[PDB]
Amino acid sequence: MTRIAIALAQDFADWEPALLAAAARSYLGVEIVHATPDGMPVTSMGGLKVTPDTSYDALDPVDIDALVIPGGLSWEKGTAADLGGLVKRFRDRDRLVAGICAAASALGGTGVLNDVAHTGNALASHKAYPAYRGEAHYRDQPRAVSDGGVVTAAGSAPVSFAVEILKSLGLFGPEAEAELQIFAAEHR
Amino acid sequence: MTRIAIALAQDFADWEPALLAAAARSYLGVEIVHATPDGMPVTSMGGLKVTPDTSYDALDPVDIDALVIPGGLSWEKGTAADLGGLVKRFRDRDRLVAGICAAASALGGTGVLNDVAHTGNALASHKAYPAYRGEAHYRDQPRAVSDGGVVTAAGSAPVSFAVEILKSLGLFGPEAEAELQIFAAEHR
Numbered sequence A, B: 001m002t003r004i005a006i007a008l009a010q011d012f013a014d015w016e017p018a019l020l021a022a023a024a025r026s027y028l029g030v031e032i033v034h035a036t037p038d039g040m041p042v043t044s045m046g047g048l049k050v051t052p053d054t055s056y057d058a059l060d061p062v063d064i065d066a067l068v069i070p071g072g073l074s075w076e077k078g079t080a081a082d083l084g085g086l087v088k089r090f091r092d093r094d095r096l097v098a099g100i101c102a103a104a105s106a107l108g109g110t111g112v113l114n115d116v117a118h119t120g121n122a123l124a125s126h127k128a129y130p131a132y133r134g135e136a137h138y139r140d141q142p143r144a145v146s147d148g149g150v151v152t153a154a155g156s157a158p159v160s161f162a163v164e165i166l167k168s169l170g171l172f173g174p175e176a177e178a179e180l181q182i183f184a185a186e187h188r
Helices: A018-027 A084-092 A102-110 A123-127 A158-168 A174-187 B018-027 B084-092 B102-109 B123-127 B158-168 B174-187
Strands: A003-007 A031-036 A049-051 A066-069 A096-100 A145-147 A150-153 B003-007 B031-036 B049-051 B066-069 B096-100 B145-147 B150-153
Touching (some): A018 A158, A066 A102, A066 A158, A084 A102, A145 A158, A150 A158, A158 A174, A174 B158, A174 B174, B018 B158, B096 B102, B102 B123, B145 B158
Parallel strands (some): B003 B031, B003 B066, B066 B096
Antiparallel strands (some): A049 B049
């Protein structure tokens, strides 16, 4: 069985982790662990008051298969959490790490994007971080990218972000594909 | 001041009210009131433990411009809230009522779809409710429908659901369109 940690924060982007968590948990039998930087409740961009299971510091990769980090306003408000140690903790156990929107650029700041293909909201967004050394690997494309156990996406790409995470986890069978392929039709 | 009530429930579909709430509240200056049937917490399909602001019976249309009902599993689980009184309260005040996915068929069960153009997950989903007498007006199309102060959509159409709610409220300006137009690109 698969366990995914979703690292929430104040002003998290409601639409970014939603389809992944709802489909994984309710359709695919995945356990979802929600965490916040200090283990206390946070309020999403859309005003949802959410109580997490745990804090970032308590997350243990020993039995969590993936770390998924949604974007949101904390970065631009100057209150973003320190993800460096948390990302390294998961990488050290060769777990999937996924970041979307502002959190993709925060991943760049950890160094984890230095050596793998990736994307984000914009290359300039990643380059704002001095530790980001991954510029040659950035791919300016609309859909999520998955490479080397790291999945990244722009905040405009929540569906492919979900698909790539599930694919990477070996969970993208017919049920998963049936539930996630339905979102394109309203854009035709 | 525009205020939108979002009527959550146990096992609500995380991806359905997310874009609307986040964009409205964070970008467009809209106040979001989240409610559950008994006013106490509920758990989304994705496992979010959400503490709402209030209960359904405290929602007063004198003060609230729109009632937005996400779908989710309560209907299929046979534990859904009775929406008839709440919907009538809002409709009688000529407030927008919007329902997506299973909640669109639940709105059909109140009779509110009898006289307006609408859509849903499928015509047969609406027909499962004996009070639904709107078959002549059902639109089998991928995008949300807005007519007569009622907005409906399939669960696969969260973006157009949000856009039609915002248009109904006279809030779909250049800022709204810019935040909401970005989701098509990942589908080609």
